[PDB]
């Protein structure tokens, strides 16, 4: 029921994309880049993610595991890098303290997640 309870990540994440949209840190990232007005992102960047997209994705039930979430949010982060490279930029580093706040929250999420795949495969 609760223990190992494989569905418990999806309200976790809810809850982490919720902390994510209050970071001033997150603006850049909330909203698809505007592409009709800033068209040289799609020679740069393959495969466009922003947060707003990760919400739905995640409203819609359309992320298998928290796995597959924490991908999508890795490619935002990808992204701001490949886009903006420099360290010098504020916005590079705006990007790198967030990655940081992401990675640090979304460790438990995604261990706990394994543990129960472990302990019902297990049993
Ligand atoms: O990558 C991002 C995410 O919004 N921002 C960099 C950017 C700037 Cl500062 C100005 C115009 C376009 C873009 Cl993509």
Same mark, same amino acid.
């Given at each position: 029921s609760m223990s190992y309870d494989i569905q418990a990540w999806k309200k976790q994440c809810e809850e982490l994309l919720n902390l994510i949209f209050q970071c001033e840190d997150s603006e850049p990232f909330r909203? /698809?880049?505007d592409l009709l007005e800033y068209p040289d992102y799609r020679d740069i960047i393959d495969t466009p993610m922003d947060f707003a997209t990760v919400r739905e994705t995640l409203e819609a039930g359309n992320y298998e595991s928290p796995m597959e979430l924490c991908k999508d949010v890795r490619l935002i982060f990808s992204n701001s890098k490949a886009y903006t /490279?420099?360290?010098?930029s504020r916005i590079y580093s705006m990007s790198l303290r967030l990655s940081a706040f992401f990675e640090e929250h979304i460790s438990s999420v995604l261990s706990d997640y394994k543990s129960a795949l472990r302990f019902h495969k297990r049993n």
């Amino acid at each position: 029921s609760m223990s190992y309870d494989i569905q418990a990540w999806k309200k976790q994440c809810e809850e982490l994309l919720n902390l994510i949209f209050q970071c001033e840190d997150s603006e850049p990232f909330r909203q /698809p880049v505007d592409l009709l007005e800033y068209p040289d992102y799609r020679d740069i960047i393959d495969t466009p993610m922003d947060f707003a997209t990760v919400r739905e994705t995640l409203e819609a039930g359309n992320y298998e595991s928290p796995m597959e979430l924490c991908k999508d949010v890795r490619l935002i982060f990808s992204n701001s890098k490949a886009y903006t /490279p420099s360290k010098r930029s504020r916005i590079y580093s705006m990007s790198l303290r967030l990655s940081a706040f992401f990675e640090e929250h979304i460790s438990s999420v995604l261990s706990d997640y394994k543990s129960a795949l472990r302990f019902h495969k297990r049993n």
